[PDB]
Design a protein around this ligand. Sequence first.
Ligand SMILES: [Cu+2]
Ligand SMILES: [Cu+2]
Ligand SMILES: [Cu+2]
Ligand SMILES: [Cu+2]
Ligand SMILES: [Cu+2]
Ligand SMILES: [Cu+2]
Lengths: 333, 333, 333
Amino acid sequence: DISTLPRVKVDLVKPPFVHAHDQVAKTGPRVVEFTMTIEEKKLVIDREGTEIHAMTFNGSVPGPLMVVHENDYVELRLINPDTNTLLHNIDFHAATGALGGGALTQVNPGEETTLRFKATKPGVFVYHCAPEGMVPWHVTSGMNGAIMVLPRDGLKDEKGQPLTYDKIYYVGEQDFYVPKDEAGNYKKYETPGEAYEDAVKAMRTLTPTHIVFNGAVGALTGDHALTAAVGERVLVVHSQANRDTRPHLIGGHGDYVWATGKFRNPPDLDQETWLIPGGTAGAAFYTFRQPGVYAYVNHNLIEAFELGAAGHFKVTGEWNDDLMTSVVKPASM
Amino acid sequence: DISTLPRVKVDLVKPPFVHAHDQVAKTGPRVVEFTMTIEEKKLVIDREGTEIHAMTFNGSVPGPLMVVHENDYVELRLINPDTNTLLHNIDFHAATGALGGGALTQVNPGEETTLRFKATKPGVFVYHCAPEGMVPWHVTSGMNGAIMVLPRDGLKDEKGQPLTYDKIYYVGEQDFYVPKDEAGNYKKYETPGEAYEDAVKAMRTLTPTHIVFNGAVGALTGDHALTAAVGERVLVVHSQANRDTRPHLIGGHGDYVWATGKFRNPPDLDQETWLIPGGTAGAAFYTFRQPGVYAYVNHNLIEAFELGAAGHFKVTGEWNDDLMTSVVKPASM
Amino acid sequence: DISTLPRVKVDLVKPPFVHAHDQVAKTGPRVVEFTMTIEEKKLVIDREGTEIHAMTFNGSVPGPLMVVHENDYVELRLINPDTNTLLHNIDFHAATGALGGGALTQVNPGEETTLRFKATKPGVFVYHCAPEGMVPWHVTSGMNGAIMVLPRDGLKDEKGQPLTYDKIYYVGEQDFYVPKDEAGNYKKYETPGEAYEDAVKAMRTLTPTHIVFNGAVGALTGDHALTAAVGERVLVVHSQANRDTRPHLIGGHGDYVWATGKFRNPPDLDQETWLIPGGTAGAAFYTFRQPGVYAYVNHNLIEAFELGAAGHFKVTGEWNDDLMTSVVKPASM
Ligand SMILES: [Cu+2]
Ligand SMILES: [Cu+2]
Ligand SMILES: [Cu+2]
Ligand SMILES: [Cu+2]
Ligand SMILES: [Cu+2]
Ligand SMILES: [Cu+2]
């Protein structure tokens, strides 16, 4: 049976970008093959040069977004090179059985493995590393990403009418818990193992030191802001593998939102802000109507503006005065 | 076009009360004009006399509730008198473009401005101050409120049947982060600027020192409890501009609840407790069936009973023994 | 009227198990009688022997799950034996009036009382102790449980088709705040009253020291794991009386989920993780398709793996290779 199915190999791209795919399936079920290489590496996460030992899927935080269709088979080749120091594995919330695949994918440095699973449910799901005994440490070190399982006939609104996006971006939100000394300065370590004991004490406080989008404070700002034009329909997939978040587009809305990200449910309309529970991926669809800069944020404003959970969208086009206008510009009373 | 539309000026009232309005629109689209004056002032927030420098819209925490209908134009005159010390602005989650109006409304002390925007989406939305660089500080100092955009044909249940309320109250929930000395006593400052540096360190802990309704511990209790009678239908609008909350009416329910507050979505029925994400306004409809005192609370009971997030409802009417009755009054075994 | 109704006495069972009942009602409305005895007792909650003075309904944390049908009358006999030291009462979120019954059920040691209320709304609800002035202390000491009010015609899916479970389990999640000394070691007390002052200071930090299922770290693991077989439909009721949680079945899904637990609303489909607000009970339905061990967790992984919020399911049956298979077992590159 599977033997007889067609197979296509797909090369992943770095977040916030997403690999090429079809919204409405043009072929029947296939075996979609992906390859990911584990990379343990130092990462500076803020302006002051704070550095951590990140554990990544393909060298990025978050790991890349995989896109398949309902009932395709996902075949993943997972490689843990001998240059790494720790055992890793992968748990797909999209999969059924063996702890999401975690029990079947344990690889020490120098090993690789190939897992296959059937994508039976449509929606966006979180995938993350989960080794017995050190699950939170690997997850909060950036070892998580997401997979989107699109219905074979694409996305639909509450009335069952088609929703087609022109652009899609993947925003992975990460809560970090950097160990601190007595005065409050962040500690630095030579290897991941040296950090272990302190990491556990830092996590138990339940208070992140940093909460960032795309691995670093300001990662999606300035020259890295997300782009769009007035009239374009944009799908924003957002994931948080360990902690709740409440996304919000400043100056815009979520026209259609699947906060818990499962496509067989009708979306919520006109959301100002929505809650994505820790351990979940969600998606929001919006059509831009005004040009300018928009701030995309976690709406606990302390987490957004003090801790790092803020990004930008720069949109081009003509301003619509009917929607909004400054009647009297700021001036002396 | 707008030139030709009728205009009505509306005078706002202090929370928890709401200005007069029509549920079902009797006229066509209009330009609804409001005026708000910014007021920086000292506020004692608890029984022990803890004082803070609040930043308010119209002298209250939360700012007043504005009520318009879908497709009306909101025209707001915002005045920042010379008696204030800081730059302020306003961001309406109900608006589209320019950061909700934040980029078009920056006024220093002694200035004013007039913004107009089209209310294209029905629901309850949060509005708040958001100056570049000090967003969380202004929000957590009480500078936020809400606006309700009613469908032109009023509220409806899941089956599309009309829902008419007899009374409406606005509960604004506020998380405060008062700086403390080494022993745990709250600090006091002469001006807002003197508090700034300490405020930022207090916010980064992510742990509020107070969480109150209507600006102070016990604000909606005793002689200030909300009132109703058995048989009355009450709509309770609740907003939290920075942090999640989980409202609950002790002894009652939320018969119809729009937790994320957007009216084009059908409401949830029979809720015991519901989650309103930080940066959102929600609404719950309930018909009183028993007289007596009801406690309206944030259901994290520590936040409610230790931190200040609790209010009362005193309802008049006849007791219904079919619904509830004490069969055997407390007595010695 | 009530005089004329049939009455049935039901003996409760210890969580995670649930007392015998009918899903679809075979008789008309009845007066269902229950008896609960309050028990103040020492409980060791972790591996290191940390001990607390728990306040319980029937000797367990959580208290037992009560199951009735819509429009039955619940008649509860509540006994507070003279061996206890504190005043207690009970508040049913399922009830209407008198603070959920809290104002009618205050019993000092040596007293008892009998309350009756009509179960007018279907769903799973939280019930908990709530004495004036010490509400959070009694709740966070384990004095809470849940009641399920089933529609008279059983559970249904989004299309109104019947959903019948073969097994049902009740998972009560508890956040504990154990007082600590300067070095971080947990304190021990002789009686509940001796703990009082320190308990309040511990709660105000808003940071639990332990978050457990069924009263202790590892309570639902090893020989106490929940059981099922491939093909069985299982309903898992989960409650959190004071704090938000985000349940997740590792290796599975929530096929039908009522996150806020009210049955008149259609369930959410295919959830990976769902949010149950503090002060609420929810229910998830799933059909097992793969055998093996599954971890049932609160998906804030620090709370699950560091703090205690983790349990197991051991399922028997044949492995399905179509759903998942290890193509290449872990081996040297
Ligand atoms: Cu790993
Ligand atoms: Cu997971
Ligand atoms: Cu301001
Ligand atoms: Cu905002
Ligand atoms: Cu008690
Ligand atoms: Cu309660």
